[PDB]
């Protein structure tokens, strides 16, 4: 028989941060300009999608087929600083950080943990070190230009630009896949206190990796933890413990849309011709509205709603046809998931119901 479990994710404990931390990146290619290797946003809900299908040879070629997607809030993302990393015979070593002369209340509120009692003195000496000349800064920058075979940039989100209310910014580091590390840090230095799209990293007809932390479910025992049957000790004998809130990594994820907040009628295919953003009736379920850019990707990401995720651009040069097919949407369901949704727009609600006692 098989074993009622895997063995790879074996120390089934909770992770240490809700930010699932990037561990891998595709290595480099020092011929291109710089391309950001990752991005991050906040998962919001699911929808259903039909899609006409250019899949040569498949049974469903040139047919409509319904599939199911998710959605994530993807505001613009501002850069605040960089770090270098050098190869050793130990591994890698953080040797310098540098920050960007003016920092948001959000990230100042991240590094502090009890905000309002704080004097909010986070970088007041660093901005003073940003002198008339920036001498020490350029000292500790050109160092990295010399050293630091590979380099990362810090980001933070603009979370006030979401329906969510947490007030706090989720830092991260992001690796680059350009060359000319001097050019990398020069590019980033120009990008200091400057923000970046998600259609400026990704596009359609793309595959991604989705790394996040799962929904928690508490201390569920064997019968629902491992799907094991019901009536010294070894470490693979299917004993009860914590489920959920593990980190995971989900790959081979076909994007269909790279949305846009300013673009009205985000739910518009070529077919619908209806001025509706994808935010369906009722708001999202435990998430609010989508008045920003977004992504529509098939399958189902690890997470729960109003949870953060991190994105990576598939980490290698894929080989399957499905990694290269050309997407064409036909219709977005835009109904409320707060019930068995029937109607896309409240004007359609008015139209099919008619006028009512409260209407006049």
């Amino acid at each position: 028989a098989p074993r009622h479990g895997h063995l790879g994710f074996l120390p089934r404990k909770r992770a240490a941060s809700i930010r699932a931390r990037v561990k891998a990146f595709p290595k480099d290619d020092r011929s291109k300009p710089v391309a950001l290797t990752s991005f991050l946003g906040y998962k919001a809900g699911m929808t259903t999608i039909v899609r006409d299908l250019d899949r040569p040879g498949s049974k469903f070629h040139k047919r409509e087929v319904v599939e199911a997607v998710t959605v994530v809030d993807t505001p613009p993302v501002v850069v605040v600083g960089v770090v270098g990393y050098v190869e050793t015979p130990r591994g890698l070593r953080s040797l310098t950080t540098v920050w960007a002369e003016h920092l948001s209340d959000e990230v100042k509120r991240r590094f502090y943990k009890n905000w309002y009692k704080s004097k909010k003195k986070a970088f007041t000496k660093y901005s003073a070190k940003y002198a008339q000349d920036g001498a020490g800064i350029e000292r500790e920058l050109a160092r990295i230009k010399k050293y630091a075979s590979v380099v990362r940039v810090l980001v933070h989100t603009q979370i006030r630009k979401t329906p969510l209310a947490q007030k706090k910014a989720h830092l991260a580091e992001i690796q680059l896949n350009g060359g000319s590390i001097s050019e990398k840090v020069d590019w980033a230095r120009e990008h200091f206190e400057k923000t970046v799209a998600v259609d400026s990293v990704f596009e359609q007809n793309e595959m991604i990796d989705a790394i996040a932390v799962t929904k928690g479910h508490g201390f569920e025992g064997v019968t629902h933890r491992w799907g094991t049957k019901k009536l010294h000790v070894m470490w693979s004998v299917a004993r009860a413990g914590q489920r959920g809130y593990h980190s995971r990594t989900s790959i081979n994820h076909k994007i269909y849309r790279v949305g846009k907040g300013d673009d009205e009628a985000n739910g518009a295919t070529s077919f619908d011709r209806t001025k509706k953003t994808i935010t369906p009736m009722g708001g999202f379920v435990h998430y609010g509205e989508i008045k920003n850019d977004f992504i529509m990707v098939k399958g189902c990401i690890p997470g729960n709603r109003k949870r953060i995720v991190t994105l990576r651009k598939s980490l290698y040069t894929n080989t399957s046809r499905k990694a290269l097919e050309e997407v064409s949407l036909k219709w977005i369901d835009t109904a409320s998931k707060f019930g068995k949704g029937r109607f896309q727009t409240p004007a359609e609600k008015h139209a099919f119901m008619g006028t009512l006692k409260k209407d006049l």
Partner: protein
Amino acid sequence: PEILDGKNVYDFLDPEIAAKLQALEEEEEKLENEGFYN
């Protein structure tokens, strides 16, 4: 396009649809002035 807010178009699509639109344009031209929509 093949689709609207509701009642997708291939149950609507025929010729003389502009003629029917005028056949109802005259009707609303009747009923707008009679105070029926008071």
